[PDB]
């Protein structure tokens, strides 16, 4: 099961860095070593992509509070939420009673940047 040994294991950072470097300096003269250069290069390319993502969300954090729902301990609760919604029809049988008319208020704000009245 698997290919013949082509290089170092993943956790060997110094060994992988050597193959990743050769991807640019020493051209490969066989498929096996070229594949190894890509796999070793993949380690750092993937690490860089994840690295920037973590940096980006720290330097420029997400502004909404929705992401508090993605906490690990809240995941099972979110799963149960989608399986426990009230049965019925998507269409409204009776008008909804809200204390604020959001569509009407929204229209006024866009037109004037000012609340009605």
């Amino acid at each position: 099961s698997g290919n013949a040994a082509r290089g170092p294991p993943l956790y060997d950072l110094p060994g992988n860095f050597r193959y990743a470097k050769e991807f640019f300096t020493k051209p490969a003269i066989s498929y096996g070593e070229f594949h190894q250069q890509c796999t070793s290069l993949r380690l750092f390319v993937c690490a860089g992509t994840v690295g920037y993502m973590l940096f980006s969300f720290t330097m420029w954090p997400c502004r909404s509070s929705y992401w508090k729902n993605w906490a690990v301990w809240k995941v099972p609760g979110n799963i149960m939420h989608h399986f426990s919604k009230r049965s019925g029809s998507i269409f409204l049988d009776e008008p909804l009673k809200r204390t604020i008319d959001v569509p009407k208020t929204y229209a006024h704000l866009i037109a004037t940047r000012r609340l009605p009245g």
Binding site: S1, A4, A5, S30
Partner: protein
């Protein structure tokens, strides 16, 4: 019945020529860089080192394990099989042998070694109770840890050393 997936010469007599050819390929004879100096007696080997060969030097080459390996059923002419791989590691493990890297480089081939899928039909049917699967697993681990970029050149240089050999299977 004769051994599975073998060409029957007559009745129960199988045709095991391929098995013999594969065995000769690994060159199962001690190799040393320096010839025995005059006045030198047997090579030193401690009891502990000699104990490593206990489970591997007892093979009778019956080929029961060879013909019980499904990987050998599919690729008999490319896969060395449980018996030949067990013997290859016997010489690799031997302390007296000084060509460990050459042997590991040659055996480090996708067809020769890595067709073993851990089925374990080899250890189950061994008449002498040897464990070819265990030895094959150790050889893979040793090769993976010891691999170097220069192994391919090592194989080539040994092939040049075999240039004047007669016909037959060999290191190449």
């Amino acid at each position: 019945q004769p051994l599975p997936h073998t060409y029957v010469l007559k009745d129960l007599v199988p045709d095991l020529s391929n098995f013999y050819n594969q065995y000769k390929s690994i060159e199962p004879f001690l190799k040393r860089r320096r010839a025995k100096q005059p006045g030198e007696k047997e090579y030193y080997q401690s009891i502990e080192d000699r104990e490593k060969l206990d489970g591997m030097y007892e093979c009778n080459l019956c080929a029961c394990c060879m013909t019980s390996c499904p990987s050998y059923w599919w690729n008999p002419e490319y896969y060395l099989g449980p018996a030949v791989l067990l013997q290859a590691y016997r010489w690799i493990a031997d302390s007296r042998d000084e060509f460990t890297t050459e042997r590991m480089a040659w055996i480090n081939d996708s067809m020769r070694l890595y067709r073993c899928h851990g089925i374990m039909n080899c250890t189950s049917c061994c008449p002498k109770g040897l464990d070819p699967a265990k030895a094959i697993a150790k050889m893979k681990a040793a090769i993976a840890a010891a691999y170097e970029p220069g192994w391919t050149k090592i194989v080539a240089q040994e092939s040049i050393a075999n240039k004047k050999r007669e016909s037959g299977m060999m290191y190449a």
